């Protein structure tokens, strides 16, 4: 929350956190598992949705404050989509009977707190700058959405590494 800040330390925190969030084993994979999508043929159908997320090229074209603003607005949309996905996710009390893993649900529950933490650091940095479908189909969209989110964070970590 608080904004204890020396520019280089904060930037180090942002580089570290964003480079970590690109890792598909943290959200996308447990998601595929807990929704029963972990079968080879279905997996290939979990690819990013073209235009769902800003390209690395658009992100690089932005300029410092613009980058933070676009990043922050996107994470906003992500938190909302995530809140929606989470409500439709199997409930902890039904996992055993359905043969699912509580560890996958626990990993998935870190998504929101992690993103809020990143958003807080983004605001602190901004302060340092001088200025339809059935249920089956919906699970697949969740798939594609998370895949796009991880690729997006990858692009984001790349822009930060050159800060």
- CATH code for position 133: 1.20.1250.10
Answer whether 122's CB lies under 8 Å from 74's CB: no
Domain that holds residue 134: 1-163
Technique behind the model: X-ray
Ordered DSSP codes for the chain = ------HHHHHHHHHHHHHHHT-GGGTHHHHHHHTT--SHHHHTT-PPPTTSS--HHHHHHT-HHHHHHHHHHHHHHHHHHHHHHHHTSPPGGGHHHHT--HHHHHHHHHHHHHHHHHHHHHHHHHHHS-----HHHHHHHHHHHHHHHHHHHHHHHHHHHT-
Number of domains in the chain: 1
């Amino acid at each position: 929350g608080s904004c204890s800040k020396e520019y280089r330390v904060l930037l180090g925190q942002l580089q570290k956190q964003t480079d970590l969030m690109q890792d598909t084993s943290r959200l996308l994979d447990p998601y595929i598992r807990i929704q029963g999508l972990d079968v080879p043929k279905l997996r290939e159908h979990c690819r990013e949705r073209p235009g769902a997320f800003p390209s690395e090229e658009t992100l690089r074209g932005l300029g410092r404050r613009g980058f933070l603003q676009t990043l922050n607005a996107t994470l906003g949309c992500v938190l909302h989509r995530l809140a929606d996905l989470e409500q439709r996710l199997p409930k902890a009390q039904d996992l055993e009977r359905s043969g699912l893993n509580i560890e996958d649900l626990e990993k998935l529950q870190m998504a929101r707190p992690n993103i809020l933490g990143l958003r807080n650091n983004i605001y602190c940095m901004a302060q340092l700058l001088d200025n339809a479908s059935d249920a089956f189909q919906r699970k697949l969209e969740g798939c594609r959405f998370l895949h796009g989110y991880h690729r997006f964070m990858h692009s984001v970590g790349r822009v930060f590494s050159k800060w």
